[PDB]
């Protein structure tokens, strides 16, 4: 997150931190996700395609930093990952980019909700919010480009929603972006979500409820001018994720 505010996890307890284990035992950082239901976390396809082996990952839930323990975290494996069985990705757009991980402790276990653990609600069919709206996005990723570490304290942002008509504009990014996903962004270009981010949620207030309206999926470069994050349209899902869960 480019700008923005360090936070701890109290205040985003719907955040998943997914990580992966590489041969010899080291284990980095991959991507977020966010927790629907106890046993699954949903996020982006594009975080896992290149390594789609389940057994590669680990879930955090409850967890506020990169390297510490965070009293009330539960650690997980992934017992299913099912990813979207036509994404695919352009120079800049991806396509259908959402995946689902079905989540279990070593005992066999999903989550256990407690006051750093929860679920975020989905969206209705056909009902997301009016363009202009502030919603917010979390993350451990980037906070320059320029970086190549990440923080070690979990940040958020807030950034507004964009419509399809001037998301379509030119010099921001034509028919590249279509009406399965949704743009957002800074009105000053000074904050963004950016690379490491990716997977994790927009959530905006909508009627009264906090609800999962977007994952983070894909920009031109972070924080740049005229060109937003792009973000995966859940409402649109709604079918692909009742028949997949
Ligand atoms: N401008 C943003 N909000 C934004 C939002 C999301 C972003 C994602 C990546 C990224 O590195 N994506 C990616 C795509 C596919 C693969 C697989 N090769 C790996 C990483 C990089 C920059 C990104 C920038």
């Excluded at 920009?219 to 792009?230: I, M, S």
């Amino acid at each position: 997150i480019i700008g923005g505010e360090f936070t701890t996890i109290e205040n985003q307890p719907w955040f998943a931190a997914i990580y992966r284990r590489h041969r010899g035992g080291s284990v980095t950082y991959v991507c977020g996700g966010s927790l629907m239901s106890p046993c699954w976390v949903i996020s982006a396809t594009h975080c896992f395609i290149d390594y789609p082996k389940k057994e590669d990952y680990i879930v955090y839930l409850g967890r506020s930093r990169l390297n510490s323990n965070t009293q009330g975290e539960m650690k997980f494996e992934v017992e299913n990952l099912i990813l979207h069985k036509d994404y695919s990705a352009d120079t800049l757009a991806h396509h259908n980019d959402i995946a689902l991980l079905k989540i279990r402790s070593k005992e066999g276990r999903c989550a256990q909700p407690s006051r750093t653990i929860q679920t975020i609600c989905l969206p209705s069919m056909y009902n997301d919010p009016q363009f202009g709206t502030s919603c917010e996005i979390t993350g451990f990723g980037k906070e320059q480009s320029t970086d190549y570490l990440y923080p070690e304290q979990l940040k958020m942002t807030v950034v507004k929603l964009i419509s399809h008509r001037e998301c379509q504009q030119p010099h921001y990014y034509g028919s590249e972006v279509t009406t399965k996903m949704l743009c957002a962004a800074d009105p000053q270009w000074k904050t963004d979500s950016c690379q490491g981010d990716s997977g994790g949620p927009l959530v905006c207030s909508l009627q009264g409820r906090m609800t999962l309206t977007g994952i983070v999926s894909w920009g031109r470069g972070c924080a740049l001018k005229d060109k937003p994050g792009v973000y995966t349209r859940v409402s649109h899902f709604l079918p692909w994720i009742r028949s997949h869960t």
